[PDB]
Amino acid sequence: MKASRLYTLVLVLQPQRVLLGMKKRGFGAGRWNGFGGKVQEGETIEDGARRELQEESGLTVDALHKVGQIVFEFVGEPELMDVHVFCTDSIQGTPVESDEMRPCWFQLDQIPFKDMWPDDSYWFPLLLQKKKFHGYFKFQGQDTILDYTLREVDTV
Residue numbers belonging to the annotated binding site for N(6)-methyl-AMP: 8, 23, 117-120
Closest CB to ligand 6U4 among 55 and 152? Answer: 55
Sign of dihedral through CA atoms 113, 88, 61, 153?
negative
Q: Which of 119, 126, 132, 148 binds ligand 6U4 (CB under 6 A)?
A: 119
- Residue 37 found at the interface with Na ion (CB under 5 A): yes
Residue nearest to Na ion (CB): 37
End-to-end CA distance of the chain: 21
> Cα(156)–Cα(132) distance, rounded to whole angstroms?
6
> Cα(135)–Cα(27) distance, rounded to whole angstroms?
25
Q: Which of 12, 18, 36, 68 binds ligand 6U4 (CB under 6 A)?
A: 36
Residue 104 Cα distances to 4, 9, 156, angstroms: 30, 16, 28
Residue 10: beta bridge partners?
35, 86
* Beta carbon of residue 24, minimum distance to ligand 6U4 (angstroms, whole number): 12
Could you give the 3-state DSSP secondary structure of residue 148? strand
Closest CB to ligand 6U4 among 14 and 40? Answer: 40
* Beta carbon of residue 63, minimum distance to ligand 6U4 (angstroms, whole number): 18
Q: In this chain, which stretch among 32-40, 57-65, 107-115, 144-152 interacts with ligand 6U4, using CB under 6 A?
A: 32-40
> Cα(42)–Cα(69) distance, rounded to whole angstroms?
20
* Beta carbon of residue 25, minimum distance to Na ion (angstroms, whole number): 12
- Residue 126 found at the interface with ligand 6U4 (CB under 6 A): no
